[PDB]
């Protein structure tokens, strides 16, 4: 009940929308036999809709004036209340993104220490790429240990015109 | 017309005189390169500005430069 919003568990617009979708899906049930493939498909879609509304609700998710769930993003404001899960868990993307970056940077540096590193880019060295992909699980430790040693950057060896 | 200039970083490969389609550049003797010849441009009034000499220049940076300027009947490539 922050930023003027209300929990999805006590909102009339949320229930109104839920019944609307359950009704528009149920209107298509009369056009088919009670035991065929379109009937089974429509029944599976109805079960998924009921489960999603139940899953979206009772999990601290709150909506505002229209039944649509809103998301709290300020840390602290999302930590003082049970709203950390909605967007404060940015560390999942940061982990996968840093994993991709560390694997690519390790492949660029290692491949450059070879005669003509070009054809190694158009024709990947798959045993070296697979070995470097499964070796970068602890990428933040390698990043902090490669920064203190100064092996992450260059001093002044850049094609500049400044 | 356009102003063409030839800098001292020329190597005398004679490629700009071969790439010029209006006979603007020439090769004069010089004593500052291995080929002992440097390009020149006596017929500057016939420069059209297609910049083929700059593409034919192999040194970095280009020894020949075509600075565009005022246009005349010859530099505008008009046939009428």
């Amino acid at each position: 009940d922050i930023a003027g919003l209300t929990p999805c568990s006590e909102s009339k617009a949320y229930n109104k929308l839920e019944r609307k979708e359950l009704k528009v899906l149920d209107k298509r049930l009369k056009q088919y036999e009670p035991g065929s493939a379109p009937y089974l498909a429509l029944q599976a879609t109805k079960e998924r809709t009921e489960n999603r509304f139940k899953t979206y609700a009772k999990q601290g998710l709150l909506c505002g004036n229209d039944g649509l769930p809103h998301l709290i993003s300020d840390p602290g404001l999302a930590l003082r209340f049970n709203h950390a899960g909605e967007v404060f868990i940015t560390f999942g993307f940061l982990y996968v993104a840093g994993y991709i970056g560390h694997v690519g940077r390790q492949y660029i540096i290692l491949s450059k220490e070879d005669a003509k590193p070009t054809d190694k880019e158009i024709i990947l060295d798959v045993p070296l790429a697979l070995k470097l992909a499964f070796q970068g699980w602890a990428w933040p430790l390698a990043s902090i240990q490669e920064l203190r040693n100064g092996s992450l950057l260059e001093k002044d060896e850049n094609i500049t015109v400044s | 017309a356009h102003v063409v200039k030839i800098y001292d970083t020329c190597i005398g490969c004679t490629q700009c005189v071969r790439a010029c389609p209006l006979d603007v550049l020439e090769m004069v003797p010089w004593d500052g390169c291995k080929a002992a010849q440097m390009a020149s441009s006596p017929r500057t009034e016939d420069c059209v500005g297609c910049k083929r000499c700059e593409t034919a220049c192999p040194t970095d940076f280009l020894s020949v430069r075509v600075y565009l300027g005022n246009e005349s009947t010859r530099s505008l490539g008009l046939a009428y």
Binding site: N65, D66, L68, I159, T160, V161 | C50, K51, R52, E54, T55, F61, R65, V66, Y67, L68, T73, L76, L78, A79, Y80
Partner: protein, 219 residues
């Protein structure tokens, strides 16, 4: 308003990127180090070294005018829709239909344009007809600007040469002659005329729609 504010931030940073890059890399770059010796508005530096089309700072500003127009169009679309939904007591329309772009195109560009295009139909006309006329006039100016933006000078130079031959070898019209030789517009001039046509159409079309859609259903 969150997403629209982020769209405004995107437009501001992109226009600033184009203008700041064109200002800092104005006196030289690695592709052309003696750019400062060529002035501020030159066509290019030939098709050599890969090609140097649109390399001057004038060209960079030219490219930034489009981004400025897009950013101002986004901020004015946002302002007009929020006030358009607040003035009619239907503030819940924009708040629930402004999240998706289809909602933007339907409830903003398609719904508020019902009275503008009805300025003149086969059943007569009304006060909004002048706005309806200039609403299409802006579209025509915009489309003419796309011509100078897409088509480049060499194609037009050959075309003008054929027209010169036609006027010289034709009877009863060869008596007159041009005092100055006809030639195609230059590369920089073509970019400037196209930008002027693009900006004029972009301004006239939105002014017509804004005044008509507001004047048409309000006071």
């Amino acid at each position: 308003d969150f997403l629209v504010h982020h769209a405004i931030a995107l437009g501001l940073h992109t226009t600033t990127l184009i203008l700041v890059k064109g200002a800092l890399d104005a006196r030289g770059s690695k592709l052309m180090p003696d750019k400062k010796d060529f002035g501020y508005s030159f066509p290019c530096d030939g098709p050599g070294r890969g090609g140097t089309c649109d390399i001057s700072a004038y060209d960079a500003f030219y490219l930034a005018v489009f981004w400025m127009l897009n950013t101002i169009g986004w901020v004015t679309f946002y302002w007009h829709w929020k006030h358009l939904t607040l003035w009619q007591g239907n503030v819940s329309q924009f708040d629930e239909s402004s999240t998706y772009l289809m909602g933007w195109l339907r409830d903003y560009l398609w719904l508020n344009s019902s009275q503008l295009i009805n300025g003149y139909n086969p059943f007569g006309m009304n006060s909004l007809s002048v706005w309806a006329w200039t609403f299409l006039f802006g579209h025509l100016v915009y489309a003419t600007g796309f011509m100078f933006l897409i088509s480049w000078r060499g194609y037009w130079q050959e075309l003008i040469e054929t027209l010169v031959w036609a006027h010289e070898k034709t009877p009863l019209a060869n008596l007159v002659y041009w005092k100055d030789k006809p030639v195609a517009l230059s590369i920089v001039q073509a970019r400037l005329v196209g930008l002027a046509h693009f900006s004029v159409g972009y301004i006239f079309t939105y002014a017509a729609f804004l005044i008509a859609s507001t004047a048409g259903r309000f006071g």
